[PDB]
Amino acid sequence: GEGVQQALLKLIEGTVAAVPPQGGRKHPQQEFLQVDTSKILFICGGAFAGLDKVI
Amino acid sequence: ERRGSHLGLIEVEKPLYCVEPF
Amino acid sequence: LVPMVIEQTSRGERSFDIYSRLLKERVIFLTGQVEDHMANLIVAQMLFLEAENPEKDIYLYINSPGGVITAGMSIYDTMQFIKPDVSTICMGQAASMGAFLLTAGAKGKRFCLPNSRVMIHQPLGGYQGQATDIEIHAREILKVKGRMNELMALHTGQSLEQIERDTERDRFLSAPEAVEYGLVDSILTHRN
Amino acid sequence: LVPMVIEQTSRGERSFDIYSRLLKERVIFLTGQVEDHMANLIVAQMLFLEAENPEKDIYLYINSPGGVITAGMSIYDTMQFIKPDVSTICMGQAASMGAFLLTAGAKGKRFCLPNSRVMIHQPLGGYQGQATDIEIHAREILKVKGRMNELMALHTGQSLEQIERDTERDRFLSAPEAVEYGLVDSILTHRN
Amino acid sequence: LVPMVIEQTSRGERSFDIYSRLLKERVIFLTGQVEDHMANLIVAQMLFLEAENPEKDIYLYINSPGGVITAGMSIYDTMQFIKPDVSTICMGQAASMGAFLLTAGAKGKRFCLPNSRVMIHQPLGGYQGQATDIEIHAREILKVKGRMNELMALHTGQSLEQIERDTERDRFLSAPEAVEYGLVDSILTHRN
Amino acid sequence: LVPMVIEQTSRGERSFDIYSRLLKERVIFLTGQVEDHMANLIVAQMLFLEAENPEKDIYLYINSPGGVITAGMSIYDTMQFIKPDVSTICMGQAASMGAFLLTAGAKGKRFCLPNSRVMIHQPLGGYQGQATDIEIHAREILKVKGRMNELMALHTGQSLEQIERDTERDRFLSAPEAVEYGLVDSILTHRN
């Protein structure tokens, strides 16, 4: 829960993440592809069952 | 170099249940 | 007010009553005047204990001034029926009914505290009505008197004649004296 | 109404009654008239604490005006049987059974508050019936007096003759005076 | 019916009793006649609060009409024994024992409401039986009278002669008058 | 017997009794005869409420056929002590002590329903014993009568002479008549 929210605070805003080595034809492993998530739109969907009462 | 990596555990708690005379 | 105690195990913490906690340890309390409501409660405890472990002994603490004969016999029959041995411990006082249930414990597992007091006497009773009805109840109580003495002699190891003469009136027996009579086997003084 | 208190532990906070909370600290309360029902409750508490820690002392508060003798001989036998020393603190009043249960504590672990009152008298009884039965009951009450008088002499250090001359009639003793007879050892006035 | 309240804390919300809720704030209620049962409850509450933090003063409200002197001295001895200062507040009424426990509070921490009433009188008692027994009880209650007066003079500061003279008959004192007599130090009228 | 209600909260919902639910909304009920036990309970409620919000008002619904004077004064002092204003509403009946606690509310916050009866009379008491003791008790009750009249004149605004002559005997007042005297400030008939 909260732990995942604390990990997205910089992914949703922007940071240089360390992508896992590879899932394709990339030969090296230590490459640890560096991508900037500061121009990546992030939609988030949920059902929030119970929020109606809070409101 | 072949090296293993450990992973944390669930970290479950031990709840208590109280019993009364009736 | 009965206090609440805690039992620590690798299942979770559980709060128990002082009396309920001791029930888990095969300990049953027999306190106050013997009657049908408390007798049925003790009977239920005995049947429940033998289900958990029918081999382990069941401890019965007796501190009572006596009670109804029918209620006591319910406990006596239940004790001699269940497979596990019933260990009787006398603390305080043990009257006619309390003494009968005390000596009814397993041979060699009857204990008494050093300052405990024991009393034995013939059963009491009475009936008001027609003469014909009195004879019916008079013979019934007499049968009980003889039946109780026979059982008392069996457990105490004495003769039926000695029991009748001694139980004619109130007879007070201390812990050391009860051992000679046969109502108990040993006396507990200190935890060795 | 008994207030409920909370205790903070590693596992979490738990709510217990004031008396139960003090029970965890090996503190037993003896209040009101002594009877079989309350006596068994105290006996259960003593046995439970012994199993938890048979080497830690037990504290027994005594604010009772007296009661049944048999009820008080079970507690006494239970205190002398268990291994841990049972400390006794007189709080306000200690009558015959309370004082008998106050001097029976472990030597060196008996206390009496500065404004506490201790009273010692001889056993009271009575019986209605035939002369033959009166004699039986009379002899028994005379044995309890001698038995209790001897136990007090052992725990106080006074001669049996003195106990017989001091318990014939009600004898009120203040905390400073109890220290001179042997019922208690020291007086608690402040923390340090 | 006793209302139930909820306390919001860092760990969450806990539902306590109105009386138990105030116990967490070092507040104890002394209401009704003084007896052994309620006295032991107050004693337990004081000891529990001392263990938590023996540096913060304890508040004891007094709206009692009096009671036995044995159970009252148990509370008095506990108040002077514990390290923290017990602040007494007179609410409504303070009788003989209620006023002895009000003046027995920490100096400078004794308060009384403006419309509170205080009454002080000598001890009451009596006994039936042989003249010899009456002599024993007569001298004992007299010692209590002299002892209570001595303690009353200590806290109030008045001479023992004045206390004895004023205690012969029932003496009613209002909140302002009690301040001059030494029973209390200040009067609480409005917050701040 | 007492119904239970639920309070929907953002986190979830908790169950409360009807009386404790209203306590959360700063509403206290004063029902039945006034005595020390219920009076101290009301005192605790008032103190607890001012801690949560020392600025919000407190509502006290009064329906009682009078009671003890000492117990009532404990409530009066508590109301005048706490910072928040206490609003008093009379429902059905208001007797001598109930009316004193009704008029003791904050100015402009003393209401009463249209179909309500209010009674005011001088205190009543008695004492059996020696002439000297009777004289002492007579002066005490007389002082109480004067003090009660003085406080009533303060809140109502009437002269002391008027109160003395009016309260000499039972005086029944309705909601409109109570406004003229000064016991209340307004009458509630319909919402808004």
> Considering Cα of F39, then F40, then F42, then F43, what sign does the dihedral take?
positive
Contact: D44, C22; criterion CB under 8 Å? yes
Please check whether residue C65 is in contact with residue C95, taking contact to mean a CB–CB distance below 8 angstroms: yes
- Give the contacts of D140 (CB within 8 A, at least 6 positions apart): C117, C172
The CA distance from C16 to D45, in Å, is: 13
Amino acid code (one letter) for B9 = L
- Give the contacts of A54 (CB within 8 A, at least 6 positions apart): F10
Q: Judge whether F87 counts as a catalytic residue.
A: no
D140 phi, psi to nearest 5 deg = -70, -45
Query: What would the two tokens of residue D128 be?
Result: 């209605």
The CA distance from F40 to E113, in Å, is: 14
Chains E and F touch (3+ CB pairs under 8 A): yes
Contacts of A53 in chain F (CB under 8 A): 8, 10
F188 phi, psi to nearest 5 deg = -100, 115
Contact: F17, E1; criterion CB under 8 Å? yes
Contact: F36, E92; criterion CB under 8 Å? yes
- Give the contacts of C117 (CB within 8 A, at least 6 positions apart): C92, C93, C94, C172, C173, C174, D70, D73, D140, D144
> Dihedral through CA F158, CA F161, CA F167, CA F171, nearest 10?
-60
The CA distance from C110 to C98, in Å, is: 13
The CA distance from D180 to E138, in Å, is: 23
The CA distance from C55 to C84, in Å, is: 5
Nearest to F60, CA basis, from F39, D186, F51, F69: F39
Chains E and B touch (3+ CB pairs under 8 A): no
The CA distance from B6 to D92, in Å, is: 64
Breaks (C-N over 2.5 A) in chain D follow: none
Please check whether residue E43 is in contact with residue D27, taking contact to mean a CB–CB distance below 8 angstroms: no
Q: Which of D8, D10, D11, D15 to mutate to test the interface with B (most CBs of B within 10 A)?
A: D11
Cα angle, residue F10 at apex, residues F4 and F13 outer, rounded to 5°: 20
D66 phi, psi to nearest 5 deg = 115, 180
- Give the contacts of C42 (CB within 8 A, at least 6 positions apart): C28, C30, C60, C75, C78
| Residue whose token pair is 């995942």 | A4
At C29, which helix (H) or strand (E)?
strand C27-31
Contact: D31, E44; criterion CB under 8 Å? no
Contacts of D20 in chain C (CB under 8 A): 3-5
How close, in Å, is residue D36 to chain E by CA atoms? 18
Q: How far is CA D132 from the centre of its chain?
A: 35
D60 phi, psi to nearest 5 deg = -125, 110
The CA distance from D63 to D30, in Å, is: 6
Q: Where are the beta strands (DSSP E) in F74-185?
A: 86-94, 110-112, 117-120, 171-174
H/E/C letters for each residue in chain E?
CCCEEEEEECCEEEEEEHHHHHHCCCEEEEECCECHHHHHHHHHHHHHHHHHCCCCCEEEEEECCCECHHHHHHHHHHHHHCCCCEEEEECCEECHHHHHCCCCCCCCCEEECCCCEEEECCCCCCCCCCHHHHHHHHHHHHHHHHHHHHHHHHHHCCCHHHHHHHHCCCEEEEHHHHHHHCCCCEECCCCC
Return the exposure string of D28-59: e unless at least 16 CB atoms fall within 10 Å of the residue's CB, then b.
Answer: bbbbeebbbebbbbbbbbbbbbbeeeeeeebb
The CA distance from D20 to C6, in Å, is: 10
At A37, which helix (H) or strand (E)?
none
Q: What's the Rg (C-alpha) of chain F? A: 18
Chains A and C touch (3+ CB pairs under 8 A): no
F71 phi, psi to nearest 5 deg = -65, -40
The CA distance from D116 to D188, in Å, is: 11
Query: What would the two tokens of residue F167 be?
Result: 């309260």
Alpha-helical (H) ranges within A1-55 are 2-8, 51-54
Contact: B14, C2; criterion CB under 8 Å? no
- Give the contacts of E72 (CB within 8 A, at least 6 positions apart): D92, E34, E39, E97, E100, E101
How close, in Å, is residue C49 to chain B by CA atoms? 19
Please check whether residue D34 is in contact with residue C7, taking contact to mean a CB–CB distance below 8 angstroms: no
With an 8 Å Cβ cutoff, is D11 touching chain E? no
Among the listed residues D87, D96, D116, D185, the single catalytic one is D96
Q: Which of F4, F41, F76 to mutate to test the interface with E (most CBs of E within 10 A)?
A: F41
Q: According to the CATH classification, is domain C4-187 in 3.50.50.60?
A: no
Amino acid code (one letter) for C46 = M
The CA distance from E57 to E55, in Å, is: 7
**Number of residues that make up chain D:** 192
Alpha carbons within 13 angstroms on the beta-carbon side of residue F163 total 22
Query: What would the two tokens of residue A9 be?
Result: 């605070």
With an 8 Å Cβ cutoff, is D14 touching chain B? yes
The CA distance from C123 to C144, in Å, is: 8
Please check whether residue D16 is in contact with residue D49, taking contact to mean a CB–CB distance below 8 angstroms: no
Counting as contact any 3 or more CB pairs under 8 A, the partners of A are F
Q: Judge whether F170 counts as a catalytic residue.
A: yes
With an 8 Å Cβ cutoff, is E135 touching chain D? no
The CA distance from C143 to C145, in Å, is: 5
Query: What would the two tokens of residue B11 be?
Result: 């970290």
Return the exposure string of D4-13: e unless at least 16 CB atoms fall within 10 Å of the residue's CB, then b.
Answer: bbeeeeeeee
Please tell me which of the candidates F77, F136, F147 has its beta carbon nearest to residue E170.
F136
Cited resolution, angstroms: 2.8
How close, in Å, is residue C41 to chain B by CA atoms? 14
Query: What would the two tokens of residue D58 be?
Result: 């037990």
Nearest to C169, CA basis, from C116, C123, C100, C102: C123
Identify the burial level of F30 via C-beta atoms within 10 angstroms of its C-beta, where 0-12 means exposed, 13-18 middle and 19 or more buried: buried
Alpha-helical (H) ranges within C82-159 are 96-103, 131-156
User: 3-state DSSP: chain C helix, strand, coil percent, rounded to 5?
Assistant: 45, 25, 35
Q: How far is CA F154 from the centre of its chain?
A: 15
The CA distance from C178 to D3, in Å, is: 46
Region of residue E12 (phi > 0: left; psi between -120 and 50: alpha; otherwise: beta): left
- Give the contacts of F63 (CB within 8 A, at least 6 positions apart): F30, F31, F90, F91, F92, F93, F94, F98
Counting as contact any 3 or more CB pairs under 8 A, the partners of E are D, F
Contact: D73, C115; criterion CB under 8 Å? yes
Please check whether residue C117 is in contact with residue C174, taking contact to mean a CB–CB distance below 8 angstroms: yes
How close, in Å, is residue E92 to chain F by CA atoms? 5
- Residue D178 pairs in a beta bridge with none
Q: Where are the beta strands (DSSP E) in F12-85?
A: 13-17, 27-31, 58-64
The CA distance from C64 to C38, in Å, is: 12
The CA distance from A29 to D167, in Å, is: 96
DSSP string over F117-137 = EEEE--------S-HHHHHHH
Please tell me which of the candidates D45, D132, D137 has its beta carbon nearest to residue C3.
D45
SS3 at position D73: helix
Among the listed residues F121, F137, F155, F166, the single catalytic one is F121
- Chain F residue at shortest CA distance from E3: F20
Alpha carbons within 13 angstroms on the beta-carbon side of residue B20 total 5
Chains C and B touch (3+ CB pairs under 8 A): yes
Query: What would the two tokens of residue F20 be?
Result: 């404790």
The CA distance from F170 to F99, in Å, is: 12
Amino acid code (one letter) for C68 = V
Return the exposure string of F112-143: e unless at least 16 CB atoms fall within 10 Å of the residue's CB, then b.
Answer: beeebebbbbbeeeeeeeeeeeeebbeebbee
CB atoms within 10 A of CB F65: 14
Contact: E15, F19; criterion CB under 8 Å? no
Give F5-8's long-range contacts (Cβ < 8 A, gap of 24+).
Answer: F8/A53
**Number of residues that make up chain E:** 192
Query: What would the two tokens of residue F31 be?
Result: 């029902």
The CA distance from C1 to D2, in Å, is: 9
- Residue D60 pairs in a beta bridge with D28, D88
Give, to the nearest 10 degrees, the angle between helix C69-81 and helix C96-103: 10
SS3 at position F64: strand
- Give the contacts of B9 (CB within 8 A, at least 6 positions apart): none
At C63, which helix (H) or strand (E)?
strand C58-64
What 8-state DSSP symbol labels residue C160?
H
At D23, which helix (H) or strand (E)?
helix D18-24
- Residue F62 pairs in a beta bridge with F30, F90
At D153, which helix (H) or strand (E)?
helix D131-156
Nearest to E83, CA basis, from E51, E54, E49, E125: E54
Q: How far is CA C103 from the centre of its chain?
A: 7
Contacts of B14 in chain C (CB under 8 A): 12-13
With an 8 Å Cβ cutoff, is C7 touching chain B? no
CB atoms within 10 A of CB E185: 18
Cα angle, residue D49 at apex, residues D43 and D52 outer, rounded to 5°: 145
How close, in Å, is residue D87 to chain E by CA atoms? 17
The CA distance from E61 to E65, in Å, is: 13
Contacts of D29 in chain E (CB under 8 A): 40, 44
Amino acid code (one letter) for C14 = R
SS3 at position D170: coil
Q: Which residues of C are catalytic?
A: 96, 121, 170
How close, in Å, is residue A44 to chain F by CA atoms? 23
Nearest to E110, CA basis, from E124, E127, E94, E122: E94
Contacts of A54 in chain F (CB under 8 A): 10
Among the listed residues D77, D159, D170, D186, the single catalytic one is D170
Nearest to B17, CA basis, from C7, D175, F23: C7
CB atoms within 10 A of CB F54: 11
CB atoms within 10 A of CB E112: 29
Q: Judge whether D37 counts as a catalytic residue.
A: no
CB atoms within 10 A of CB A8: 12
**Number of residues that make up chain C:** 192
- Chain D residue at shortest CA distance from B14: D11
Return the exposure string of E3-35: e unless at least 16 CB atoms fall within 10 Å of the residue's CB, then b.
Answer: bbbeeeeeeeeeebbbbbbbbeebbbbbbeebe
- Give the contacts of C126 (CB within 8 A, at least 6 positions apart): none
Contact: F44, E19; criterion CB under 8 Å? yes
- Chain F residue at shortest CA distance from A51: F10
- Residue F118 pairs in a beta bridge with F94, F173
- Give whole-number Cα distances, D20 to C62, D2, D25, in Å: 25, 10, 9
With an 8 Å Cβ cutoff, is B4 touching chain C? no
E146 phi, psi to nearest 5 deg = -65, -35
Contact: F23, E6; criterion CB under 8 Å? no
Contact: C17, B21; criterion CB under 8 Å? yes
